[PDB]
Amino acid sequence: LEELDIVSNNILILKKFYTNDEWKNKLDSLIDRIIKAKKIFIFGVGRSGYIGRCFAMRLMHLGFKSYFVGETTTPSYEKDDLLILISGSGRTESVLTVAKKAKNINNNIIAIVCECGNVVEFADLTIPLEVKKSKYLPMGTTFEETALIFLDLVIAEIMKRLNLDESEIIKRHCNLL
């Protein structure tokens, strides 16, 4: 069970955000920017985008004005807003297009990447999730898994700091489907 061992050890890399000062600062900065922002925008392509949507939905559940770029009712990016980009290689052209346009409005851009590609040049804060890849866990597979877990841990930390319960989520959760 080589693949399960790789995934298990990849999740352990997230311990740095609680024990090491340089990584704790990245987590603290991400949370501080989320609380101070007027509106929060999330973007990613493919599987990185689906993981991005999971986080966007959860931020909305907590009461933030959260949006995913590309969707129906997503408005204009303004000066007091925040953009969070999720990309494996950090080289995806569609992610760079969104980064360039946001850069003309403000500097509040965060990049969650595996490899430090071109997108980091446009980011104010870069959060690298350097995970182990495998033959049977190709492309950004392990990054997408670890990024989802990291983003759920950010939600966990936001709930702790603002004293939010599960009741806040039920109140704002979709009830039509």
PDB file of C-alpha atoms in Angstrom:
ATOM      1  CA  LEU A   1       0.000   0.000   0.000  1.00  0.00           C
ATOM      2  CA  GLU A   2       2.538   2.544  -1.319  1.00  0.00           C
ATOM      3  CA  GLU A   3      -0.084   5.144  -2.388  1.00  0.00           C
ATOM      4  CA  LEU A   4      -1.844   5.261   1.001  1.00  0.00           C
ATOM      5  CA  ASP A   5       1.549   5.761   2.713  1.00  0.00           C
ATOM      6  CA  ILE A   6       2.380   8.672   0.376  1.00  0.00           C
ATOM      7  CA  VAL A   7      -1.000  10.320   1.093  1.00  0.00           C
ATOM      8  CA  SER A   8      -0.570   9.750   4.882  1.00  0.00           C
ATOM      9  CA  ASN A   9       2.902  11.358   4.893  1.00  0.00           C
ATOM     10  CA  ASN A  10       1.647  14.279   2.747  1.00  0.00           C
ATOM     11  CA  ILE A  11      -0.986  15.157   5.388  1.00  0.00           C
ATOM     12  CA  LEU A  12       1.773  15.219   8.042  1.00  0.00           C
ATOM     13  CA  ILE A  13       3.506  18.070   6.132  1.00  0.00           C
ATOM     14  CA  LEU A  14       0.606  20.299   7.317  1.00  0.00           C
ATOM     15  CA  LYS A  15       1.960  20.064  10.906  1.00  0.00           C
ATOM     16  CA  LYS A  16       4.418  22.893  10.021  1.00  0.00           C
ATOM     17  CA  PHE A  17       1.525  25.401  10.100  1.00  0.00           C
ATOM     18  CA  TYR A  18       1.124  24.772  13.847  1.00  0.00           C
ATOM     19  CA  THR A  19       4.725  24.133  15.008  1.00  0.00           C
ATOM     20  CA  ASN A  20       7.084  26.200  12.805  1.00  0.00           C
ATOM     21  CA  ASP A  21       6.983  30.034  13.099  1.00  0.00           C
ATOM     22  CA  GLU A  22       7.581  30.848   9.397  1.00  0.00           C
ATOM     23  CA  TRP A  23       4.674  28.636   8.316  1.00  0.00           C
ATOM     24  CA  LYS A  24       2.373  29.692  11.191  1.00  0.00           C
ATOM     25  CA  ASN A  25       2.850  33.269   9.923  1.00  0.00           C
ATOM     26  CA  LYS A  26       1.567  32.266   6.451  1.00  0.00           C
ATOM     27  CA  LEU A  27      -1.570  30.722   8.023  1.00  0.00           C
ATOM     28  CA  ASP A  28      -2.072  33.748  10.328  1.00  0.00           C
ATOM     29  CA  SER A  29      -1.672  36.129   7.373  1.00  0.00           C
ATOM     30  CA  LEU A  30      -4.204  34.153   5.264  1.00  0.00           C
ATOM     31  CA  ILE A  31      -6.792  34.304   8.091  1.00  0.00           C
ATOM     32  CA  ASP A  32      -6.111  38.015   8.808  1.00  0.00           C
ATOM     33  CA  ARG A  33      -6.640  38.925   5.118  1.00  0.00           C
ATOM     34  CA  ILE A  34      -9.892  36.876   4.994  1.00  0.00           C
ATOM     35  CA  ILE A  35     -11.335  38.716   8.050  1.00  0.00           C
ATOM     36  CA  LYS A  36     -10.234  42.168   6.792  1.00  0.00           C
ATOM     37  CA  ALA A  37     -11.469  41.736   3.198  1.00  0.00           C
ATOM     38  CA  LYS A  38     -14.786  43.168   1.976  1.00  0.00           C
ATOM     39  CA  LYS A  39     -15.359  40.381  -0.599  1.00  0.00           C
ATOM     40  CA  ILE A  40     -13.311  37.182  -1.118  1.00  0.00           C
ATOM     41  CA  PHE A  41     -12.671  35.723  -4.591  1.00  0.00           C
ATOM     42  CA  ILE A  42     -11.449  32.183  -5.267  1.00  0.00           C
ATOM     43  CA  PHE A  43     -10.199  30.771  -8.597  1.00  0.00           C
ATOM     44  CA  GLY A  44      -8.593  27.658 -10.011  1.00  0.00           C
ATOM     45  CA  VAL A  45      -8.837  25.491 -13.132  1.00  0.00           C
ATOM     46  CA  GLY A  46      -9.813  21.802 -13.328  1.00  0.00           C
ATOM     47  CA  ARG A  47      -9.460  19.763 -10.127  1.00  0.00           C
ATOM     48  CA  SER A  48      -7.744  22.695  -8.361  1.00  0.00           C
ATOM     49  CA  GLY A  49     -10.885  24.712  -9.115  1.00  0.00           C
ATOM     50  CA  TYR A  50     -13.273  22.106  -7.675  1.00  0.00           C
ATOM     51  CA  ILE A  51     -11.216  22.099  -4.458  1.00  0.00           C
ATOM     52  CA  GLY A  52     -11.384  25.916  -4.655  1.00  0.00           C
ATOM     53  CA  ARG A  53     -15.188  25.779  -4.835  1.00  0.00           C
ATOM     54  CA  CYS A  54     -15.258  23.586  -1.675  1.00  0.00           C
ATOM     55  CA  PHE A  55     -13.454  26.377   0.210  1.00  0.00           C
ATOM     56  CA  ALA A  56     -15.546  29.172  -1.394  1.00  0.00           C
ATOM     57  CA  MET A  57     -18.762  27.451  -0.273  1.00  0.00           C
ATOM     58  CA  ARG A  58     -17.443  26.958   3.271  1.00  0.00           C
ATOM     59  CA  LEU A  59     -16.388  30.650   3.616  1.00  0.00           C
ATOM     60  CA  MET A  60     -19.936  31.584   2.601  1.00  0.00           C
ATOM     61  CA  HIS A  61     -21.288  29.185   5.287  1.00  0.00           C
ATOM     62  CA  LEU A  62     -19.364  31.184   7.916  1.00  0.00           C
ATOM     63  CA  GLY A  63     -20.864  34.517   6.819  1.00  0.00           C
ATOM     64  CA  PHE A  64     -18.191  35.974   4.528  1.00  0.00           C
ATOM     65  CA  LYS A  65     -19.015  37.500   1.120  1.00  0.00           C
ATOM     66  CA  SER A  66     -17.364  34.670  -0.814  1.00  0.00           C
ATOM     67  CA  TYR A  67     -17.321  34.187  -4.596  1.00  0.00           C
ATOM     68  CA  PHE A  68     -15.852  31.825  -7.165  1.00  0.00           C
ATOM     69  CA  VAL A  69     -14.592  33.528 -10.355  1.00  0.00           C
ATOM     70  CA  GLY A  70     -16.426  32.312 -13.456  1.00  0.00           C
ATOM     71  CA  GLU A  71     -19.833  31.766 -11.850  1.00  0.00           C
ATOM     72  CA  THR A  72     -23.197  33.449 -12.525  1.00  0.00           C
ATOM     73  CA  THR A  73     -23.507  36.026  -9.757  1.00  0.00           C
ATOM     74  CA  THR A  74     -19.808  36.786  -9.188  1.00  0.00           C
ATOM     75  CA  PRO A  75     -19.312  40.624  -9.180  1.00  0.00           C
ATOM     76  CA  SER A  76     -16.448  43.021  -9.859  1.00  0.00           C
ATOM     77  CA  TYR A  77     -13.181  42.824  -7.932  1.00  0.00           C
ATOM     78  CA  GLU A  78     -12.691  46.049  -5.939  1.00  0.00           C
ATOM     79  CA  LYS A  79      -9.741  47.627  -4.038  1.00  0.00           C
ATOM     80  CA  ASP A  80     -10.685  46.242  -0.593  1.00  0.00           C
ATOM     81  CA  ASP A  81     -11.130  42.668  -1.874  1.00  0.00           C
ATOM     82  CA  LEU A  82      -9.036  39.489  -1.700  1.00  0.00           C
ATOM     83  CA  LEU A  83      -8.161  36.963  -4.423  1.00  0.00           C
ATOM     84  CA  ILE A  84      -7.014  33.425  -3.590  1.00  0.00           C
ATOM     85  CA  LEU A  85      -5.503  31.383  -6.440  1.00  0.00           C
ATOM     86  CA  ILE A  86      -5.070  27.603  -6.313  1.00  0.00           C
ATOM     87  CA  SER A  87      -2.749  26.051  -8.908  1.00  0.00           C
ATOM     88  CA  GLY A  88      -0.486  22.982  -8.951  1.00  0.00           C
ATOM     89  CA  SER A  89       2.293  24.144 -11.271  1.00  0.00           C
ATOM     90  CA  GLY A  90       1.403  27.833 -10.958  1.00  0.00           C
ATOM     91  CA  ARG A  91       1.876  28.192 -14.733  1.00  0.00           C
ATOM     92  CA  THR A  92      -1.736  27.777 -15.979  1.00  0.00           C
ATOM     93  CA  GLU A  93      -2.505  30.604 -18.440  1.00  0.00           C
ATOM     94  CA  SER A  94      -6.123  31.119 -17.290  1.00  0.00           C
ATOM     95  CA  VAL A  95      -4.942  31.584 -13.671  1.00  0.00           C
ATOM     96  CA  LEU A  96      -2.301  34.110 -14.861  1.00  0.00           C
ATOM     97  CA  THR A  97      -4.978  36.108 -16.757  1.00  0.00           C
ATOM     98  CA  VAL A  98      -7.055  36.462 -13.551  1.00  0.00           C
ATOM     99  CA  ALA A  99      -3.885  37.312 -11.546  1.00  0.00           C
ATOM    100  CA  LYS A 100      -2.888  40.078 -14.023  1.00  0.00           C
ATOM    101  CA  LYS A 101      -6.338  41.706 -13.915  1.00  0.00           C
ATOM    102  CA  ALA A 102      -6.514  41.649 -10.105  1.00  0.00           C
ATOM    103  CA  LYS A 103      -2.963  43.061  -9.849  1.00  0.00           C
ATOM    104  CA  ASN A 104      -4.185  46.260 -11.576  1.00  0.00           C
ATOM    105  CA  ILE A 105      -6.770  46.799  -8.795  1.00  0.00           C
ATOM    106  CA  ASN A 106      -4.782  45.830  -5.632  1.00  0.00           C
ATOM    107  CA  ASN A 107      -1.899  43.748  -4.195  1.00  0.00           C
ATOM    108  CA  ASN A 108      -4.169  41.466  -2.106  1.00  0.00           C
ATOM    109  CA  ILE A 109      -3.415  38.223  -4.010  1.00  0.00           C
ATOM    110  CA  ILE A 110      -2.649  34.854  -2.359  1.00  0.00           C
ATOM    111  CA  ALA A 111      -1.311  31.841  -4.267  1.00  0.00           C
ATOM    112  CA  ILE A 112      -1.605  28.270  -2.971  1.00  0.00           C
ATOM    113  CA  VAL A 113       0.803  26.245  -5.118  1.00  0.00           C
ATOM    114  CA  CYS A 114       2.868  23.041  -5.239  1.00  0.00           C
ATOM    115  CA  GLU A 115       5.606  24.334  -7.598  1.00  0.00           C
ATOM    116  CA  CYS A 116       6.633  28.009  -7.486  1.00  0.00           C
ATOM    117  CA  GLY A 117       5.546  28.876 -11.031  1.00  0.00           C
ATOM    118  CA  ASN A 118       4.785  32.209 -12.761  1.00  0.00           C
ATOM    119  CA  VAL A 119       1.751  33.058 -10.552  1.00  0.00           C
ATOM    120  CA  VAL A 120       3.982  33.745  -7.509  1.00  0.00           C
ATOM    121  CA  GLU A 121       5.296  36.897  -9.250  1.00  0.00           C
ATOM    122  CA  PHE A 122       1.793  38.410  -8.901  1.00  0.00           C
ATOM    123  CA  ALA A 123       1.188  37.184  -5.337  1.00  0.00           C
ATOM    124  CA  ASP A 124       1.603  39.147  -2.095  1.00  0.00           C
ATOM    125  CA  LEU A 125       1.618  35.870  -0.128  1.00  0.00           C
ATOM    126  CA  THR A 126       2.665  32.480  -1.483  1.00  0.00           C
ATOM    127  CA  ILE A 127       1.750  29.291   0.396  1.00  0.00           C
ATOM    128  CA  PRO A 128       3.699  26.315  -1.110  1.00  0.00           C
ATOM    129  CA  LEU A 129       2.379  22.806  -0.372  1.00  0.00           C
ATOM    130  CA  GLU A 130       5.386  20.734  -1.454  1.00  0.00           C
ATOM    131  CA  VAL A 131       3.955  17.222  -1.549  1.00  0.00           C
ATOM    132  CA  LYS A 132       5.289  13.861  -2.730  1.00  0.00           C
ATOM    133  CA  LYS A 133       4.121  12.684  -6.177  1.00  0.00           C
ATOM    134  CA  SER A 134       3.965   9.093  -7.451  1.00  0.00           C
ATOM    135  CA  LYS A 135       3.508   7.028 -10.638  1.00  0.00           C
ATOM    136  CA  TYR A 136      -0.053   6.084  -9.619  1.00  0.00           C
ATOM    137  CA  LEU A 137      -0.856   9.487  -8.028  1.00  0.00           C
ATOM    138  CA  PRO A 138       0.033  11.682 -11.119  1.00  0.00           C
ATOM    139  CA  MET A 139      -0.137  15.401 -12.034  1.00  0.00           C
ATOM    140  CA  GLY A 140      -1.451  17.500  -9.140  1.00  0.00           C
ATOM    141  CA  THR A 141      -3.406  14.613  -7.497  1.00  0.00           C
ATOM    142  CA  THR A 142      -1.578  14.793  -4.145  1.00  0.00           C
ATOM    143  CA  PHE A 143      -1.542  18.622  -4.132  1.00  0.00           C
ATOM    144  CA  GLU A 144      -5.346  18.784  -4.661  1.00  0.00           C
ATOM    145  CA  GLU A 145      -5.890  16.290  -1.789  1.00  0.00           C
ATOM    146  CA  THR A 146      -3.545  18.153   0.590  1.00  0.00           C
ATOM    147  CA  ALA A 147      -4.919  21.567  -0.471  1.00  0.00           C
ATOM    148  CA  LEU A 148      -8.506  20.488   0.345  1.00  0.00           C
ATOM    149  CA  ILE A 149      -7.387  19.298   3.791  1.00  0.00           C
ATOM    150  CA  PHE A 150      -5.346  22.517   4.346  1.00  0.00           C
ATOM    151  CA  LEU A 151      -8.312  24.701   3.344  1.00  0.00           C
ATOM    152  CA  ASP A 152     -10.637  22.808   5.707  1.00  0.00           C
ATOM    153  CA  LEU A 153      -8.053  23.339   8.493  1.00  0.00           C
ATOM    154  CA  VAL A 154      -8.131  27.104   7.705  1.00  0.00           C
ATOM    155  CA  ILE A 155     -11.938  26.989   8.126  1.00  0.00           C
ATOM    156  CA  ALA A 156     -11.405  25.092  11.423  1.00  0.00           C
ATOM    157  CA  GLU A 157      -9.066  27.841  12.632  1.00  0.00           C
ATOM    158  CA  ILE A 158     -11.439  30.658  11.535  1.00  0.00           C
ATOM    159  CA  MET A 159     -14.274  29.057  13.565  1.00  0.00           C
ATOM    160  CA  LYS A 160     -12.011  28.794  16.665  1.00  0.00           C
ATOM    161  CA  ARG A 161     -10.868  32.440  16.525  1.00  0.00           C
ATOM    162  CA  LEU A 162     -14.331  33.896  15.907  1.00  0.00           C
ATOM    163  CA  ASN A 163     -16.175  31.454  18.263  1.00  0.00           C
ATOM    164  CA  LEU A 164     -18.445  30.039  15.528  1.00  0.00           C
ATOM    165  CA  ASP A 165     -20.465  26.826  15.863  1.00  0.00           C
ATOM    166  CA  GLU A 166     -22.013  24.312  13.426  1.00  0.00           C
ATOM    167  CA  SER A 167     -25.283  26.308  13.758  1.00  0.00           C
ATOM    168  CA  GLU A 168     -23.810  29.172  11.684  1.00  0.00           C
ATOM    169  CA  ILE A 169     -23.294  26.749   8.790  1.00  0.00           C
ATOM    170  CA  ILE A 170     -26.834  25.227   8.923  1.00  0.00           C
ATOM    171  CA  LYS A 171     -28.332  28.760   8.912  1.00  0.00           C
ATOM    172  CA  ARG A 172     -26.621  29.684   5.614  1.00  0.00           C
ATOM    173  CA  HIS A 173     -26.426  26.238   3.963  1.00  0.00           C
ATOM    174  CA  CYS A 174     -28.404  25.623   0.744  1.00  0.00           C
ATOM    175  CA  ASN A 175     -31.792  24.102   1.583  1.00  0.00           C
ATOM    176  CA  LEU A 176     -33.346  23.774  -1.874  1.00  0.00           C
ATOM    177  CA  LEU A 177     -31.612  20.639  -3.177  1.00  0.00           C
TER     178      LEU A 177
END
